[PDB]
Amino acid sequence: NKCDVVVVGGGISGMAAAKLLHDSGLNVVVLEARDRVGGRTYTLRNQKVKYVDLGGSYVGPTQNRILRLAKELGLETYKVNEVERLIHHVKGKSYPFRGPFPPVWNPITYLDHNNFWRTMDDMGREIPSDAPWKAPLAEEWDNMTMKELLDKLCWTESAKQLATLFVNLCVTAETHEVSALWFLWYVKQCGGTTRIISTTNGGQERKFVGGSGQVSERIMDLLGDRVKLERPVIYIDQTRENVLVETLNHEMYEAKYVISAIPPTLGMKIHFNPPLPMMRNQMITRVPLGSVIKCIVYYKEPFWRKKDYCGTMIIDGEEAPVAYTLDDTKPEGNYAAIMGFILAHKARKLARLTKEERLKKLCELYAKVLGSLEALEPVHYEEKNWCEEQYSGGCYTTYFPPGILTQYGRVLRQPVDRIYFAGTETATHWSGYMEGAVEAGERAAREILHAMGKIPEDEIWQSEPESVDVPAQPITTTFLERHLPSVPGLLRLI
Amino acid sequence: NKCDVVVVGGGISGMAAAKLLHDSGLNVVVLEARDRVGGRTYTLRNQKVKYVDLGGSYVGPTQNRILRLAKELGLETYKVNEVERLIHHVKGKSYPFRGPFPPVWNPITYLDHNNFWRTMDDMGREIPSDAPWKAPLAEEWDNMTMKELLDKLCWTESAKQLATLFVNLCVTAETHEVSALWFLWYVKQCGGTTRIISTTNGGQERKFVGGSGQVSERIMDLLGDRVKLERPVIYIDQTRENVLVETLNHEMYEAKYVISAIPPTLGMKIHFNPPLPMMRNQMITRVPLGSVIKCIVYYKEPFWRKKDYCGTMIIDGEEAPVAYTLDDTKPEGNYAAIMGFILAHKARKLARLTKEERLKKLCELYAKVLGSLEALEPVHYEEKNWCEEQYSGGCYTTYFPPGILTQYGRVLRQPVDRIYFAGTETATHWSGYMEGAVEAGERAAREILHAMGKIPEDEIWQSEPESVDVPAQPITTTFLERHLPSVPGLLRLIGLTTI
Numbered sequence: 001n002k003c004d005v006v007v008v009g010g011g012i013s014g015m016a017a018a019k020l021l022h023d024s025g026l027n028v029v030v031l032e033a034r035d036r037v038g039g040r041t042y043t044l045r046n047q048k049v050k051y052v053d054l055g056g057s058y059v060g061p062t063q064n065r066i067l068r069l070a071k072e073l074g075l076e077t078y079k080v081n082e083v084e085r086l087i088h089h090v091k092g093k094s095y096p097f098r099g100p101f102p103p104v105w106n107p108i109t110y111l112d113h114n115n116f117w118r119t120m121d122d123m124g125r126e127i128p129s130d131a132p133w134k135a136p137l138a139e140e141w142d143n144m145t146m147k148e149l150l151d152k153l154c155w156t157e158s159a160k161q162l163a164t165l166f167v168n169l170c171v172t173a174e175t176h177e178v179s180a181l182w183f184l185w186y187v188k189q190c191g192g193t194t195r196i197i198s199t200t201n202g203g204q205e206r207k208f209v210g211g212s213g214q215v216s217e218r219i220m221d222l223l224g225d226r227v228k229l230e231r232p233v234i235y236i237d238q239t240r241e242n243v244l245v246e247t248l249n250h251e252m253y254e255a256k257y258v259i260s261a262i263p264p265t266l267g268m269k270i271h272f273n274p275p276l277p278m279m280r281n282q283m284i285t286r287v288p289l290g291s292v293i294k295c296i297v298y299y300k301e302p303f304w305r306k307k308d309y310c311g312t313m314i315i316d317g318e319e320a321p322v323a324y325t326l327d328d329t330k331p332e333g334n335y336a337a338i339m340g341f342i343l344a345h346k347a348r349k350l351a352r353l354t355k356e357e358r359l360k361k362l363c364e365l366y367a368k369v370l371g372s373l374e375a376l377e378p379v380h381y382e383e384k385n386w387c388e389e390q391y392s393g394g395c396y397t398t399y400f401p402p403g404i405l406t407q408y409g410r411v412l413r414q415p416v417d418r419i420y421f422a423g424t425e426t427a428t429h430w431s432g433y434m435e436g437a438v439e440a441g442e443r444a445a446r447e448i449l450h451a452m453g454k455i456p457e458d459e460i461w462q463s464e465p466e467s468v469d470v471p472a473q474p475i476t477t478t479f480l481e482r483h484l485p486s487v488p489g490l491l492r493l494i
Numbered sequence: 495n496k497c498d499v500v501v502v503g504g505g506i507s508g509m510a511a512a513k514l515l516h517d518s519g520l521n522v523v524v525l526e527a528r529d530r531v532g533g534r535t536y537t538l539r540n541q542k543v544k545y546v547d548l549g550g551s552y553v554g555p556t557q558n559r560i561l562r563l564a565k566e567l568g569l570e571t572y573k574v575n576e577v578e579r580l581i582h583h584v585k586g587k588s589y590p591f592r593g594p595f596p597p598v599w600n601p602i603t604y605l606d607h608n609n610f611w612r613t614m615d616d617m618g619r620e621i622p623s624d625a626p627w628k629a630p631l632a633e634e635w636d637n638m639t640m641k642e643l644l645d646k647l648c649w650t651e652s653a654k655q656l657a658t659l660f661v662n663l664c665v666t667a668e669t670h671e672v673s674a675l676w677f678l679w680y681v682k683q684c685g686g687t688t689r690i691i692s693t694t695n696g697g698q699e700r701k702f703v704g705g706s707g708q709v710s711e712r713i714m715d716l717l718g719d720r721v722k723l724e725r726p727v728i729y730i731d732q733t734r735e736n737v738l739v740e741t742l743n744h745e746m747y748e749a750k751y752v753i754s755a756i757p758p759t760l761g762m763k764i765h766f767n768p769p770l771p772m773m774r775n776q777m778i779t780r781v782p783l784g785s786v787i788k789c790i791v792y793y794k795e796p797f798w799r800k801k802d803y804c805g806t807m808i809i810d811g812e813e814a815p816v817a818y819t820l821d822d823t824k825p826e827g828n829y830a831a832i833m834g835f836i837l838a839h840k841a842r843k844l845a846r847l848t849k850e851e852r853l854k855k856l857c858e859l860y861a862k863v864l865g866s867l868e869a870l871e872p873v874h875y876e877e878k879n880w881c882e883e884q885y886s887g888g889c890y891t892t893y894f895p896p897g898i899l900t901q902y903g904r905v906l907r908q909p910v911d912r913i914y915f916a917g918t919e920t921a922t923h924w925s926g927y928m929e930g931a932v933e934a935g936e937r938a939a940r941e942i943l944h945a946m947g948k949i950p951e952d953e954i955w956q957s958e959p960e961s962v963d964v965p966a967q968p969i970t971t972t973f974l975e976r977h978l979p980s981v982p983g984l985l986r987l988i989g990l991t992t993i
């Protein structure tokens with residue numbers, strides 16, 4: 001029954017909010033729909049794998065909030081293997097390379113690849129992180145899919161193929177499904193193309209020893225009986241003095257304030273009294289999450305390292321079930337494994353197969369790409385289709401179709417009376433990530449502290465000191481990268 | 495508690511299913527979220543208006559199922575006023591015309607307008623009504639917005655402007671929001687461009703005397719206590735022998751079968767056990783409804799008729815709050831009124847204003863369009879914003895953004911164990927309309943009768959005899975209309991001669 005704040009959802013965002021409020025002296029309850037905490041993070045333990053992340057997993061430089069929270073909880077990170085060569089597999093053949101970016105040798109193609117990435121970052125600099133709908137060309141870019149943008153910008157099929165794979169991997173959606181404004185904002189608010197795609201010095205630098213699921217589990221340990229598992233919220237009543245929150249199993253909770261820490265569209269699962277205002281009522285029907293199967297194949301040894309491959313593969317083509325892989329071997333060098341993502345329309349297509357049929361397709365692919373028969377002899381397989389989850393709706397995050405961000409965007413974190421909004425989707429830096437979940441949960445908690453007169457308005461949005469354990473190198477561009485002409489630019493110059 | 499079939503939703507689709515099942519001898523319960531039946535149809539009665547439809551309203555030729563159902567219930571139709579001239583207002587000026595279509599004088603613009611409508615219908619003929627994702631070019635057309643299709647097809651701004659207003663009016667959404675495959679399907683399954691847009695011989699020919707809300711109300715009268723108002727469904731359990739359906743007010747219903755007769759995305763409001771299959775789970779998050787305010791301004795007299803205007807206005811321009819109007823005077827000639835739609839992004843924009851501020855904007859617009867100061871003296875005003883409705887989500891219907899129809903389309907009316915799907919969105923002829931609600935409700939009911947061994951598979955989909963009261967004239971094209979070249983076609987024909 002009675003408390004100061006009810007938090008709906010026990011993922012990273014809901015747990016970070018509740019921890020903050022608890023640490024401030026307020027009485028808090030977390031209502032969680034599933035029989036576990038963690039939401040879009042999930043760590044499986046069994047004897048074969050020891051532990052494995054089946055949801056969110058990677059952290060890296062500039063993600064200072066998730067790094068500080070995990071450190072305080074007693075977690076350690078380790079580095080993803082990127083010692084040996086990366087592989088770019090294109091038109092049925094493998095090209096090993098070093099550095100973050102796959103090299104291009106044809107000169108025209110070179111100019112086209114260079115101009116595409118540069119243009120993405122240029123366009124991003126006109127987009128405010130906390131208000132993308134205030135971009136000078138907000139409407140024009142929002143009324144256009146990423147597919148239309150790629151068609152205009154890319155003068156070669158080679159650049160257009162790589163840019164498409166880039167979109168599919170970042171947001172688990174097809175280029176024709178997503179707004180150009182929304183995708184450019186998304187990349188920008190992660191620090192740009194280089195920062196988002198890199199292992200070393202980027203979003204994929206590190207993982208947590210023991211799994212990322214420990215973040216939510218350890219906060220639940222701190223909160224004890226305040227966390228209520230298998231309590232899906234069905235009903236929120238704001239007509240009276242205290243807010244009334246009802247669960248599916250017929251319990252009633254009473255509070256001064258609520259934080260909703262669930263993906264925006266999952267707000268549909270709740271019946272509101274009084275009805276939601278018009279813009280939010282419609283927004284929550286307009287914001288799907290992407291589609292992905294995360295798959296991990298285990299091997300006796302990390303045999304790719306013997307051929308001077310790190311295990312990172314960038315794989316083009318319609319036939320490949322998996323477009324991107326990373327080494328998932330434990331820091332000690334055992335439980336050798338390759339992690340890969342089956343993205344967007346391939347997730348829909350390959351979900352019809354059996355677990356065993358998917359394993360066979362992956363092994364045959366890895367054998368071609370790595371040039372090794374050893375890939376045909378897996379010792380174990382784990383996978384998770386996020387599309388089938390009632391209380392997630394997909395992964396990694398919410399995407400915006402064309403027209404939606406400019407029309408409904410400003411409503412995402414706008415309070416509805418005594419309901420405040422957290423969840424990674426409402427963040428302004430690494431929104432879509434575990435980092436964004438922490439930002440949003442702690443910000444929504446402070447909005448409530450301010451409404452209670454406990455802190456100045458000044459203190460709702462708080463900056464984060466840089467991690468000493470995971471420092472960031474700055475992103476640099478060369479003179480030639482900055483000044484080489486586009487393909488049409490070279491044509492004008494002719 | 496116990497019955498044969500629980501129907502979720504008391505709109506036209508849910509009420510048509512329940513009536514069919516009841517007439518067959520089964521015990522049915524209808525669970526309705528609101529304190530009223532009718533859903534996206536709603537008839538307001540007060541002394542000033544007598545009655546007025548604030549939601550779905552128009553019916554016309556080829557809509558035989560809604561006409562038969564209403565006739566059996568004892569309802570009458572009357573004809574929408576189209577006796578005098580239509581108006582096309584473009585670039586701040588009005589051009590009166592007769593006939594269904596605004597005339598085009600410039601021969602280039604004329605070739606462009608002719609080729610646009612023709613191409614829409616040509617592309618539609620490649621799209622199966624019952625399976626749009628089977629079109630030969632389904633993927634290509636689905637990966638493209640209507641805005642991209644218009645940019646490629648229309649070689650004049652004038653054709654592009656009119657085509658845009660056409661999309662906004664048909665599906666209450668912007669061209670950049672909707673799949674090209676979905677929109678071409680939607681028009682095709684209503685019988686094509688002419689049938690969808692027309693008053694005389696089209697979708698807008700008629701209304702029901704007394705209002706369309708009487709359809710649902712009269713079925714409720716037939717069913718008596720079997721209809722449960724203010725019972726929003728929150729939970730469906732299929733793990734046991736009988737299906738368990740729970741409501742928000744804590745009642746439990748038990749049944750052999752369930753029909754879900756709610757817009758697909760409103761399925762999100764229900765918690766399922768076991769969880770929905772993957773494709774449905776994701777589909778219901780990908781299918782929004784459009785945005786519209788329906789507004790009716792009353793006058794002492796239908797003064798536009800005196801100037802030889804019927805009251806139909808097609809109004810282009812960003813400044814105009816309303817893009818389309820119809821005479822909404824009663825068949826007896828009293829309660830003179832103009833009905834207009836505020837569509838898509840304007841519904842969002844103008845919802846910020848007060849009721850009085852919106853009234854003033856409309857009157858000032860009608861005064862320019864009709865050239866009449868009388869338009870500035872309204873006697874009464876009614877309106878309804880559908881965007882604010884928790885148990886509709888918008889109006890008129892569900893649209894599909896790019897990429898969705900080909901990936902998730904085939905799952906819309908696919909049964910999930912003992913749950914069968916009705917609602918106008920699952921229809922194959924006039925989906926989006928009251929007609930489609932009847933088709934879908936009656937088909938879902940017969941799917942259940944078949945599962946119960948009461949009818950052959952053969953009988954699930956049933957054709958409908960043509961209405962004798964509202965007959966359909968066929969849609970004809972002239973020789974010139976069929977064979978005049980497009981703009982690029984004329985240009986090719988100029989490249990060829992010179993050589």
Ligand SMILES: *[C]C1=C([C])[C]=C2C(=[C]1)N([C][C]([O])[C]([O])[C]([O])[C]OP([O])(=O)OP([O])(=O)O[C][C]1O[C](N3[C]=NC4=C3N=[C]N=C4[N])[C]([O])[C]1[O])C1=NC(=O)[N]C(=O)C1=N2[C]C1=[C][C]=[C][C]=[C]1
Pocket residue numbers: 008009010011012013014031032033034037038039040041054055056057058059169170203231232233234261262263266269270292294386391392394395396397422423424425432433434435437
């Ligand atoms: C899935 C995934 C994958 C596969 C991968 C990845 C990911 C994912 N990511 C993402 C993450 O994870 C995220 O962001 C996070 O986690 C989020 O968080 P939040 O905000 O908190 O949210 P969530 O989790 O979802 O939670 C929520 C909750 O709630 C609940 N509910 C619902 N409903 C309800 C409830 N309750 C009560 N009632 C009701 N009604 C649920 O259940 C839950 O719990 C990521 N991230 C990062 O950071 N990293 C990584 O790695 C990741 N991953 C990704 C990527 C990869 C590559 C590149 C990029 C990215």
Ligand SMILES: *[C]C1=C([C])[C]=C2C(=[C]1)N([C][C]([O])[C]([O])[C]([O])[C]OP([O])(=O)OP([O])(=O)O[C][C]1O[C](N3[C]=NC4=C3N=[C]N=C4[N])[C]([O])[C]1[O])C1=NC(=O)[N]C(=O)C1=N2[C]C1=[C][C]=[C][C]=[C]1
Pocket residue numbers: 502503504505506507508525526527528531532533534535548549550551552553663664697725726727728755756757760763764786788880885886888889890891916917918919926927928929930931
């Ligand atoms: C809105 C509108 C307007 C404004 C106009 C119009 C329209 C609309 N339209 C459409 C119609 O109306 C429709 O289609 C119909 O109505 C549909 O039906 P259905 O399918 O049945 O569906 P609904 O109605 O929605 O119902 C449902 C129900 O359910 C319920 N719920 C929900 N949720 C829930 C429930 N319950 C329990 N639980 C839960 N969870 C609700 O409440 C409801 O009741 C139209 N149509 C026609 O035909 N005509 C016309 O006129 C119309 N309009 C239109 C137009 C105009 C112009 C052109 C074109 C068109």
